[PDB]
Design a binder for this molecule. Structure first.
Ligand code: MN
Ligand code: MN
Ligand code: MN
Ligand code: MN
Lengths: 335, 334
DNA sequence: GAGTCCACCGGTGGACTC
DNA sequence: GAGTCCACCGGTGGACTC
């Protein structure tokens, strides 16, 4: 559970344990002795808790401490079972922490999407826990989907074929002269739910935890939407970075710039909203970096590439910021 | 020296050791116990060896073990001196192995400039080690400076003020909109040697090795050209990245784009040349990533990044840069 | 000395394929 | 299980300000 528990932990099967001893069955070409089982970790620590949608103690807790709990629980497990034999590299803890930050934050934005959708579809505004009721007038045509995008994803595969053919035509044009414009992905995309699904129920059900099924439910979600989204219906893009360094700033800025070149400049959509979430910005230089104008719009004919760098204090605040974003962004979508 | 020597290690002053025990002088907030003294490590390993300008064995040696040599020598020192206590985080090795890649590569490029420059200026073509006498026609006006740029640098600071005013006016434009266009820096720039220096001997001398004074010479070199470089006179920008990860590819792509927008777009420079050197592209496909078109081009066309180079040996890096200079300075009326 | 910033990258856990 | 790929980031050594 969120708070470590020796019993909860002995209840776990060997393959469900947050630490996976691989000393005697090793990743070839790696010294890795113990594996941080991040899915197992999300399961144990957040099996019953979606921060922002849980106890007041957790929703109001410093988000850094929320995101860090999985690794602390795993570290405890490892110490119980292996005592001073327990060694994980800091890069292990780095990788897992980054992935937890993204997944949990996505999960919180998922539940926000549920509650908002439920409201848009003329049901109630739920209220355990309580969040100031959104003011925008409901309509099922402005439900949103929260898509944590997978490793390797190409966000272009979200777009309706007609939009994809526009980009493909444009890139084939470049490829003849040995040039390109590859797209990768933000970590997460909030998109306007396709009509065809506006009556589907999964998009309105808040999950209770990041149990393996719900992890799957969440990380598979993008599949349901591939090929179905209009250019102007990609509402928000997010990059998660648990901490920043000056060198680790650029992937979102670059990708936001390309999203704009393509969605705005080639497909006539409105401002592409792309933001960066961090728990540890390490000075103020990132905030200045992200004041950069969108390059495409500059050199042609104007706003910033990255709308904001957000440092969520608590899960509740991330939930609040997103509702607020939806209330405000979804009034470009007609009821 | 390059090959580890217990002798040479014991004759080092305590402040010159490659490993610095900081267990009882612990760094504010860090559990680090021993530091990889990278400047000492370079003094030691490459004190008398600039790869590509040393023995043919080192020149033709696989660049990864060249660049890996200082860390290996440091671990040797730490284990001999602190036995079972010597522990160093992976991330320390990571950091130092990175700066070493960059510093040493910039030192190879420095010596190529020195030979190049010495040719341009009439003194003929040095010949140990052997490289292909560039074919282009010598001229003091086609000399170059190789500027390893320091952490925190703003490459605009290299431009002549007239060029810098154009940019600041452009950003005042934007600042009024709640906008900016911040510039950072490539890891290194090659600029046309300013006329006022084209007779200075220091730009024609090849360093024997990365002694500390030589490190400071190379790392300080940019101060001297600050404010003197015309936009078109930024010949090459290089980002060094010892290895790649798909997320670690974008700073130089982005900055290439910003440079291209500023220099080509607002200052009328030619195509700005910007490459990325790596020793380890595998597991990514950065080659595809770096085929991206310049976003300026597209708006108002060429690649942002001219190439991902993977130098197999220091000799090849020397060779490629001679090849490059020989071609790129057709543009300069010498 | 004490504190802050800068930019370095390699060891990761999981998706994917046989 | 063995191999590849993908995108995670935190622990660094040195320059800096005071
Ligand atoms: Mn994702
Ligand atoms: Mn991320
Ligand atoms: Mn540099
Ligand atoms: Mn670099």
């Amino acid at each position: 559970p969120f708070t470590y528990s020796i019993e909860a932990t002995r209840n776990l099967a060997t393959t469900e344990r947050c630490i996976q001893d691989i000393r005697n069955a090793p990743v070839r070409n790696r010294s890795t002795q113990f594996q941080l089982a991040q899915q197992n970790m999300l399961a144990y620590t957040f099996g019953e808790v979606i921060p922002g949608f849980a106890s007041a103690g957790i929703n109001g807790m410093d988000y850094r401490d929320v995101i860090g709990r999985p690794v602390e629980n795993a570290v405890t497990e490892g110490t119980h079972f292996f005592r001073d034999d327990f060694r994980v590299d800091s890069n292990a803890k780095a990788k897992v922490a980054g992935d937890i930050f993204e997944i949990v934050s996505s999960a919180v934005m998922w539940n926000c999407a549920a509650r908002w959708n439920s409201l848009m579809v003329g049901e109630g505004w739920r209220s355990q826990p309580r969040y100031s009721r959104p003011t925008l007038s409901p309509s099922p045509r402005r439900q949103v989907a929260v898509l944590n995008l997978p490793r390797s994803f190409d966000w272009v595969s979200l777009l309706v074929p007609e939009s994809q053919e526009v980009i493909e035509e444009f890139r084939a044009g470049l490829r003849k002269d040995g040039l390109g414009l590859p797209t990768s992905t933000p970590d997460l995309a909030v998109v306007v739910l396709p009509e065809e699904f506006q009556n589907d129920e999964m998009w309105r059900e808040e999950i209770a935890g990041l149990t393996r099924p719900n992890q799957i439910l969440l990380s598979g979600a993008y599949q349901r939407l591939q090929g179905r989204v209009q250019p102007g219906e990609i509402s928000l893009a997010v990059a998660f970075k648990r901490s920043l360094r000056s060198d680790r700033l650029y992937q979102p800025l670059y990708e936001a710039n390309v999203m704009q070149l393509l969605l705005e400049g080639k497909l006539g959509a409105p401002k592409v909203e792309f933001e960066v979430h961090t728990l540890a910005p390490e000075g103020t230089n990132a905030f200045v970096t992200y004041e950069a104008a969108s390059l495409y719009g500059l050199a042609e004919g104007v706003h910033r590439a990255i709308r904001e760098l957000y440092v969520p204090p608590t899960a509740a605040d991330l939930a609040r910021r997103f509702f607020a974003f939806l209330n405000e962004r979804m009034e470009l979508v007609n009821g």
